[PDB]
Amino acid sequence: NDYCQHFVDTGHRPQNFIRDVLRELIRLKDELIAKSNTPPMYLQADIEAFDIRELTPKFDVILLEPPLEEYYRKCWTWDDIMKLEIDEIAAPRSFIFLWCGSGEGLDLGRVCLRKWGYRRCEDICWIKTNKNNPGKTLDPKAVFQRTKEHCLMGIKGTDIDLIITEEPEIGNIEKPVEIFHIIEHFCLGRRRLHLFGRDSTIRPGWLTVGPTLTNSNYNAETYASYFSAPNSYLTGCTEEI
Amino acid sequence: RLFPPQWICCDIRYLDVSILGKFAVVMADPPWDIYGTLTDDEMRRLNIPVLQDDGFLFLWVTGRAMELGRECLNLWGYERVDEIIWVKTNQLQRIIRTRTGHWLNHGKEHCLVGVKGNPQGFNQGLDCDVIVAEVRSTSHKPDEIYGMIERLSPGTRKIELFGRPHNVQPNWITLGNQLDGIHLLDPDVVARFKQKYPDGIISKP
Numbered sequence: 001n002d003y004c005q006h007f008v009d010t011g012h013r014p015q016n017f018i019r020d021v022l023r024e025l026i027r028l029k030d031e032l033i034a035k036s037n038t039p040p041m042y043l044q045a046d047i048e049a050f051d052i053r054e055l056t057p058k059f060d061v062i063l064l065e066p067p068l069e070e071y072y073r074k075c076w077t078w079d080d081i082m083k084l085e086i087d088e089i090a091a092p093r094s095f096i097f098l099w100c101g102s103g104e105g106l107d108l109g110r111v112c113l114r115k116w117g118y119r120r121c122e123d124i125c126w127i128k129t130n131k132n133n134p135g136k137t138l139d140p141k142a143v144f145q146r147t148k149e150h151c152l153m154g155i156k157g158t159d160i161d162l163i164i165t166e167e168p169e170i171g172n173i174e175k176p177v178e179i180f181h182i183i184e185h186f187c188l189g190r191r192r193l194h195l196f197g198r199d200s201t202i203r204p205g206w207l208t209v210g211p212t213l214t215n216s217n218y219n220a221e222t223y224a225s226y227f228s229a230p231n232s233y234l235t236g237c238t239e240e241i
Numbered sequence: 242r243l244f245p246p247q248w249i250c251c252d253i254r255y256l257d258v259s260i261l262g263k264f265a266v267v268m269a270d271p272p273w274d275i276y277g278t279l280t281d282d283e284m285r286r287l288n289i290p291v292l293q294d295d296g297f298l299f300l301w302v303t304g305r306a307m308e309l310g311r312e313c314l315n316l317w318g319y320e321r322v323d324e325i326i327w328v329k330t331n332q333l334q335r336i337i338r339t340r341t342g343h344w345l346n347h348g349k350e351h352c353l354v355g356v357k358g359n360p361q362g363f364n365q366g367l368d369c370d371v372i373v374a375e376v377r378s379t380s381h382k383p384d385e386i387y388g389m390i391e392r393l394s395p396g397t398r399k400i401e402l403f404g405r406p407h408n409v410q411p412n413w414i415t416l417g418n419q420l421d422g423i424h425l426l427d428p429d430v431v432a433r434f435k436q437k438y439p440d441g442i443i444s445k446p
């Protein structure tokens with residue numbers, strides 16, 4: 001059988017036919033992450049007009065979710081994104097997860113990663129099924145119907161790469177919560193920043209910063225106190241001291 | 242439409258590809274330096290630019306070739322306009338999970354899609370950008386890609402670089418060093434081949 005021909009004939013995406021898309025080990029590790037998580041912290045800020053260096057201390061992990069116009073059709077362009085001074089707030093050993101969409105972002109997000117001093121080390125694809133609404137989706141440059149989005153992982157200093165869920169309803173710009181599961185299970189450190197998060201993405205263990213937040217609780221000094229000795233170098237997957 | 246399969250066993254570094262004429266689609270699955278491989282410079286120097294005026298390039302990449310392949314695609318005169326992913330499955334349609342220095346299992350391979358010129362009359366948007374297909378022998382890419390390409394550009398001439406015998410297809414010319422001899426049937430290609438290589442020997446220039 002050929003799922004490509006089947007999609008042309010029926011509108012059911014090939015990914016609709018992927019099947020099934022330790023337990024004690026995973027649960028204990030989830031538990032240790034939950035125990036080491038900082039309280040959720042969050043700040044409303046217009047990231048265009050905000051001095052990013054006010055976010056301290058330096059982060060172990062940055063999740064970057066700029067609102068691309070392609071998600072909808074203030075929207076952020078790659079010109080805007082590339083000019084964020086991410087290298088100023090990242091720890092010298094640290095990681096980035098950048099949602100790049102399905103278009104020019106696959107190239108330009110890579111330029112961003114390298115600009116900010118990272119090497120691209122994983123390409124995590126969010127594959128979207130249409131089991132509820134089989135049919136056709138187009139961009140002018142596009143050769144194929146676009147049914148996925150990419151989150152690029154970068155590393156600086158010395159689970160599977162697939163998330164499969166149903167396509168969200170129009171106007172729902174949320175990314176799968178599974179991206180947080182992947183990030184947290186890497187055990188990269190406890191200082192985690194989510195840029196362009198929303199009320200809906202606020203999460204224990206994360207500082208969320210974005211324009212649409214209705215409330216704030218961030219204080220730099222309080223935040224830094226979560227990582228003061230003896231807890232400075234914890235991975236987020238171990239018993240705290 | 243339909244022309245039968247054609248192929249040339251060669252070292253792709255040495256073949257003068259200008260004898261093959263112009264193609265609507267080029268596909269390559271290079272032996273990236275990550276039998277035998279090509280160095281990054283050998284890949285850059287491949288004379289891909291002569292193969293097309295207007296059309297599409299399909300370039301398989303893994304690992305650091307996600308970036309090196311982008312560089313090659315651009316150096317050769319293409320803009321990357323799509324990216325296909327092949328979700329690798331077993332016979333029961335479950336994902337196969339596979340590299341040292343990675344802390345994520347890999348369930349897929351990527352194929353970059355580049356455009357050169359302004360192609361006209363291709364059926365863009367018929368297929369989607371995810372292939373779900375069973376894994377076969379090592380490096381064997383799914384045959385689904387030939388179907389997607391044929392629907393995109395029916396009845397046009399295509400060329401595959403670094404193909405093996407199981408890759409030969411109608412309307413395609415296949416180049417690679419594991420193919421069996423030279424099988425050419427297009428009279429125009431036959432004539433220019435004979436003129437260039439009167440004794441059939443494609444040695445280091």
Ligand SMILES: Nc1ncnc2c1ncn2[C@@H]1O[C@H](CSCC[C@H](N)C(=O)O)[C@@H](O)[C@H]1O
Pocket residue numbers: 251252253254270271272276277278279380381382383403404405408416417418419
């Ligand atoms: N210098 C060279 N010229 C031509 N082919 C070469 C080469 N160096 C390596 N190769 C070939 O490049 C191929 C890369 S693997 C190709 C896999 C193929 N697309 C498939 O679906 O099976 C190998 O067959 C290898 O023999």
Ligand SMILES: [Mg+2]
Pocket residue numbers: 001002374375
């Ligand atoms: Mg099959």
